[PDB]
């Protein structure tokens, strides 16, 4: 049935042709960006100074909870987070679930001097080029979403473009898989993806399993300076937090409070 | 939730790549010179009382295997023009025919004839491709695409200044083809399931085609006598490749076929 056989390969050629020209355009755009700001290196400098290292997150909406902050202004939020002592930014660029946008990353980053992470669901190295073209200094790899080959390819592409990679893990199997990669940034996430239950004990347990050369980033269920001090006892001194800070009026003051008490 | 996110995210990735790719092809089409007038060249041959040949540069085929081991598209284009062809057809499909996109562009640059992209089109993106490579006409295969996709293919071709040859193999396909605007209808004598070739197919379909359409007989045409036979059914325009490609002196073979 020669027509069905031709159609099947022809559709693959068409997909490959589009991907090729798109990647060529993104390559041009990455060569016209200035160098990455050094996302990991910023966090390590905070920890070397004996301070908590915050990745401060700009998130417009939550699936479940709706619009986070009535007035949503990525550049103003970036400035307020820098003022309050944030070491780096996380900007949601996913639209259907979080009402982020690629342009929010670029605008937030231009408004301050902090390195910035593209916070989104990556399944394809094409998206790592995207991130760099938008100015990203770091990408996100989610171990629950991608297999080992794809994680390595995502991380290798990020390194080839001068960016860091935050590896998000939720359990022991994911942690063991994450330790096959090179990246030092490991995100230990307290929110169960099956149940949506949130418990700080999850990061405490995963941290015991990590070697000391990895920089652990605590995510979810972190609200107060005291939460940070607790997690610090398990070796976690870097955090990714957004919503709870965003839903307070004075974002700079909320950030200082969380970091310093 | 993760499987759902992945599903919509993969669609966003595909749409993002398609968008940037098409913007690049649109840029390329704006830097091409205007189409040469494929249909108009065939009509000018018929006006002069001559047979109108769409001469096909084809290396191989699934029905036939390798046709012409020594394959030089620019030389073949020149030889076809010399022998009296009205237009060219260039296979740009690689896995089944051993063509290439580049063969269309090189053949076209080597002569002054209009040229058809001979390939399998499933996506208007490919019509922008064709124009960007210099194509003056595209191919729409009724056996391969539904009515909505056929119309979209034809509309894209017309917006870019190109003609569209509509290929039909039976009565149902001919009727569907009459919903489109293109005047170029190809009546194809080759069964695609069995590979049987029979000139009687185009003779039968000609009894159904209205007089405003320009019928192109395709496949199974080897001799000047074959042409004279199809002329009795009103078919004076042909697409021929294999019989001509198989012969060493392509210009002389083409003159013999056209003029006897």
Curated annotation (Swiss-Prot), chain A:
SUPFAM superfamilies: Ribulose-phoshate binding barrel (SSF51366). Keywords: Amino-acid biosynthesis, Aromatic amino acid biosynthesis, Decarboxylase, Lyase, Tryptophan biosynthesis. Pfam families: IGPS. Pathway: Amino-acid biosynthesis; L-tryptophan biosynthesis; L-tryptophan from chorismate: step 4/5. Its EC number is 4.1.1.48. Gene3D superfamilies: Aldolase class I (3.20.20.70). GO terms for biological process: L-tryptophan biosynthetic process. CDD domains: IGPS. PROSITE patterns: IGPS. NCBIfam families: PRK00278.1-2, PRK00278.1-6, PRK00278.2-4. Belongs to the TrpC family. This is Indole-3-glycerol phosphate synthase. It comes from Brucella abortus (strain 2308).
Curated annotation (Swiss-Prot), chain B:
Its EC number is 4.1.1.48. This is Indole-3-glycerol phosphate synthase. The keyword Lyase applies. GO terms for biological process: L-tryptophan biosynthetic process. It comes from the Bacteria. Belongs to the TrpC family. Keywords: Amino-acid biosynthesis, Aromatic amino acid biosynthesis, Decarboxylase, Lyase, Tryptophan biosynthesis. InterPro entries: Aldolase_TIM, Indole-3-glycerol_P_synth, Indole-3-glycerol_P_synth_dom, Indole-3-GlycerolPSynthase_CS, RibuloseP-bd_barrel. It comes from Brucella abortus (strain 2308). It catalyses: 1-(2-carboxyphenylamino)-1-deoxy-D-ribulose 5-phosphate + H(+) = (1S,2R)-1-C-(indol-3-yl)glycerol 3-phosphate + CO2 + H2O. Pathway: Amino-acid biosynthesis; L-tryptophan biosynthesis; L-tryptophan from chorismate: step 4/5. GO terms for molecular function: indole-3-glycerol-phosphate synthase activity; phosphoribosylanthranilate isomerase activity.
């Amino acid at each position: 049935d020669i027509l069905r056989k031709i159609e099947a390969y022809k559709r693959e050629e068409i997909a490959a042709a589009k991907a090729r020209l798109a990647l060529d355009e993104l390559k041009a755009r990455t060569r016209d960006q200035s160098a990455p700001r050094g996302f990991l290196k910023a966090l390590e400098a905070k920890r070397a100074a004996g301070q908590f290292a915050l990745i401060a997150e700009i998130k417009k909406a939550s699936p479940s909870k709706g619009l986070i902050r009535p007035d949503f202004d990525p550049p103003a939020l970036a400035k307020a987070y820098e003022e309050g002592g944030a070491a780096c930014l996380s900007v949601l660029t996913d639209t259907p679930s979080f009402q982020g946008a690629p342009e929010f990353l670029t605008a937030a980053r231009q408004a301050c001097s902090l390195p910035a992470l593209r916070k989104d669901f990556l399944f394809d190295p094409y998206q790592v080029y995207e991130a760099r073209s938008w100015g990203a200094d770091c990408i996100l790899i989610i171990m629950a979403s991608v297999d080992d080959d794809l994680a390595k390819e995502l991380e290798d592409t990020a390194f080839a473009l001068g960016m860091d990679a935050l590896i998000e893990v939720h359990d022991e199997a994911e942690m063991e898989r994450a330790l096959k990669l090179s990246s030092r940034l490991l995100g230990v996430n307290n929110r169960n993806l099956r149940s949506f239950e949130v418990n700080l004990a999850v990061s405490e347990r995963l941290a015991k399993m990590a070697p000391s050369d990895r920089l652990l980033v605590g995510e979810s269920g972190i609200f107060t300076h005291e939460d940070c001090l607790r997690l610090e006892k398990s070796g976690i001194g870097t955090f990714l937090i957004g919503e709870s800070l965003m839903r307070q009026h004075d974002v700079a003051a909320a950030t200082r409070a969380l970091l310093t008490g």
